[PDB]
Amino acid sequence: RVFKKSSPNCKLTVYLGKRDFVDHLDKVDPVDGVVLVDPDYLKDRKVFVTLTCAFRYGREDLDVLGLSFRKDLFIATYQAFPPMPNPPRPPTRLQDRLLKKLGQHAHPFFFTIPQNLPCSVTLQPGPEDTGKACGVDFEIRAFCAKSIEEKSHKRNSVRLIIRKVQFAPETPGPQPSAETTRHFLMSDRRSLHLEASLDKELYYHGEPLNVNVHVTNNSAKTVKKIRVSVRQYADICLFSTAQYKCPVAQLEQDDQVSPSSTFCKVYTITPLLSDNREKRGLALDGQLKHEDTNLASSTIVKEGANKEVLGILVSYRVKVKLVVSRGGDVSVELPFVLMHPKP
């Protein structure tokens, strides 16, 4: 369903199809819709429309009264109401549905997004920090100032948040597996080779996590337990990079094992949202103002760019942790990535 945003001056209105836009791989999801303006107030007053890719990392007026502000990683510009001779050679089916239900004054717009823009992702705040903020987002405005598109202001500017969520490649990549050995203080017997063999690389929202963990044993230091705990990496790039480890979901059974041979259990994790709902510090996919979101997708960084990628660069991992007599809490980690499938 289409939705409009209206300014209290009933001058500009913006009609759009979807707030969530699909970041395809080969392409992006472009914007469609129209801007409906009224001609009586708008006499020789020329409207524009824009797409601001933006990066928020704190307070509005505070971090501004310094030497810098948010780096708008991108800003689109296209000229509405006086179209230099009417140049929308392709219109859109949404615009076809809008132009005829709405009046003769509706002005179409359409926004190509450069894909060197990361996604709309925000940190999960603490419980106690009240005025603290950060996150990447995509917003779009309709506006007009008397001065040409370079200068702009408020009061006619019509806001709207949108999103650009990332989507998965066809290729999953390798068969990632960790299988390795440790060395000790008071049992030189080798006690744990451990093979966290797996089945897939890039999952989606609702496909469980079976870790085929094959322990190899020689004798001593009886192992108590083996938990499998999914490690979300909460990346931040503000002035330094930053992770905040915290397990989204972790499960375990008491399958106990013996000295001088090999065991193997498949341990199955399911990371849910509503179980980590009302919890601190879990990167979630963006939302539309109240509507139900999910856990954040893994963000990936391009293989060499000029400027380091700033934002929440979400990644995950199944940490595989054990408890061993008399209770050493010991594990390992791997790489693996969570994304979307793309309409």
């Binding site: 509005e60 501004v64 948010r70 806001r159 103002k289 509507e291």
Partner: peptide
């Protein structure tokens, strides 16, 4: 120097 502050965005039908 930049943009400004807010007040709405909620309902969608």
């Amino acid at each position: 120097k930049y943009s400004a502050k807010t007040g709405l965005t909620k309902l969608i039908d």
